[PDB]
């Protein structure tokens, strides 16, 4: 057009009304914690996590205008690079005090992923800091997590932030009562130039987890449905169950739930699910 891409002009004139429509928030906005809670919940329930476009190795674009177009106009799903900075920018323009910070994810195997390639938001309301994550595949807090000591209960689970080996670390309490890290972060405000490297990291990576795989998930009231390849984790009310998905018929059943209200994405997701199952036999 006439407005240069990535200019402050471009991001400033994004039509946030359509964004709020896209996430199913049709009320009034203020800067109370209660408004922030409702916005977070709306995003989480309305937007599935998905990486379908990267199944090839095609990188996501990073600009706010490009993220906006994919999420709002094409009604695609979300992830850390394409959802979280855009949401942070929406909150900033709606008047919240917001900080985008880098994070490193804890593997199910029991070590850290090599790269600090996750991102979190910290929102400051009435002198307190609150964590928000609208770009995470697996189970994390679905209500803003306070940056304070001690267990915080949410939908039958307990989360906490605690300082561990030099880093504020978000953990989740297991059925035993053991705590397992979800991710740690650094309180270092990021702009686009600071996290751009993530794209080249995954281009350069051998066997990137975000390429050649089927990864999608959807928050539901009191839990979350997570599909990782041929496995489904059903998190619900403090309990998680697992199911090995045996047929494309059963995979499609589950993808229709994860992508409820996003039925235009199902056939591509099913195709991607089969391609990835086959490409590991």
Residue of 260, 262, 233, 230 lying closest to 248 (CA atoms): 230
Residue partners of 192: CB distance under 8 A and separation at least 6: 6, 62, 63, 85
- Is the separation of the CB atoms in 221 and 44 below 8 Å? no
Sequence spans of domains, the chain? 8-278
Calpha distance 36→86 (Å, rounded):
15
Residue partners of 233: CB distance under 8 A and separation at least 6: 138, 139, 224, 225, 226, 240, 241, 242
- Is the separation of the CB atoms in 240 and 155 below 8 Å? no
- Is the separation of the CB atoms in 152 and 160 below 8 Å? yes
Calpha distance 107→117 (Å, rounded):
13
What does the DSSP assignment read for the chain?
A: --SPTT-HHHHHT--HHHHHHHTT--S---SSHHHHHHHHHHHHHH--EE-GGGGGSPPPP--HHHHHIIIIIS---B-HHHHHHHHHHHHHHTT-EEEEEEEEEBPTTSSB-SS--EEEEEEEETTEEEEE-SS-SS---SSPEESSSS-EEETTEEEEEEEETTEEEEEEE-SSS-EEEEEEE------HHHHTHHHHHHHH-SS-TTSSS-EEEEEETTEEEEEETTEEEEEETTEEEEEE---HHHHHHHHHHHTTT-GGGHHHHHHHHHHHHHTT-
Calpha distance 277→268 (Å, rounded):
14
Burial level of 222, CB count in 10 A (0-12/13-18/19+)? middle
Experimental method: X-ray
Strand partners, 181: 171
Q: How many CB atoms lie within 10 A of CB 14?
A: 19
- Is the separation of the CB atoms in 130 and 145 below 8 Å? yes
Domain spanning 8-278, CATH architecture: 2-Layer Sandwich (3.30)
Calpha distance 159→182 (Å, rounded):
9
Distance of CA 233 to the CA centre of its chain: 16
Residue of 88, 82, 87, 75 lying closest to 58 (CA atoms): 82
Calpha distance 178→171 (Å, rounded):
10
Enumerate long-range contacts of 73-76, CB under 8 Å, 24 or more apart. 73/18, 75/22, 75/262, 75/264, 76/50, 76/52, 76/262, 76/265
Calpha distance 47→83 (Å, rounded):
9
């Amino acid at each position: 057009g006439l407005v240069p891409r990535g200019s402050h002009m471009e991001t400033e004139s994004l039509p946030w009304r359509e964004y709020l429509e896209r996430i199913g928030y049709q009320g009034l906005l203020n800067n109370s914690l209660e408004c922030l809670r409702e916005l977070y919940t709306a995003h989480l329930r309305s937007v599935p996590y998905e990486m379908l476009d990267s199944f090839d190795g095609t990188p996501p674009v990073l600009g706010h205008a490009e993220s906006f177009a994919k999420l709002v106009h094409r009604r695609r799903g979300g992830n850390c690079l394409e959802s979280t900075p855009l949401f942070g920018e929406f909150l900033r323009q709606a008047g919240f005090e917001v900080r985008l910070v880098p994070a490193q994810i804890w593997k199910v195997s029991g070590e850290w992923w090599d790269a600090w390639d996750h991102l979190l938001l910290i929102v400051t309301v009435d002198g307190e800091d609150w964590l928000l994550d609208v770009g995470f595949l697996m189970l994390t807090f679905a209500e803003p997590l306070k940056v304070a000591e001690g267990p915080q209960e949410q939908s039958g689970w307990r989360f906490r932030v605690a300082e561990e080996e030099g880093f504020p670390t978000v953990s989740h309490q297991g059925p035993d009562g053991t705590w397992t890290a979800v991710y740690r972060y650094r309180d270092e405000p990021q702009q686009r130039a600071d996290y751009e490297w993530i794209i080249d990291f995954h281009k350069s990576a051998e066997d990137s987890p975000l390429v050649g795989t089927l990864l999608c998930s959807r928050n539901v009231p009191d839990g979350k449905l997570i599909m990782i390849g041929e496995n489904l984790l059903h998190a619900r009310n403090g309990r998680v169950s697992a199911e090995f998905i045996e047929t494309t018929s059963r995979a499609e059943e589950l993808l229709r739930v994860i992508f409820a209200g996003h039925e235009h994405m199902v056939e591509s997701a099913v195709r991607t699910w089969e391609k990835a199952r086959a490409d590991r036999s």
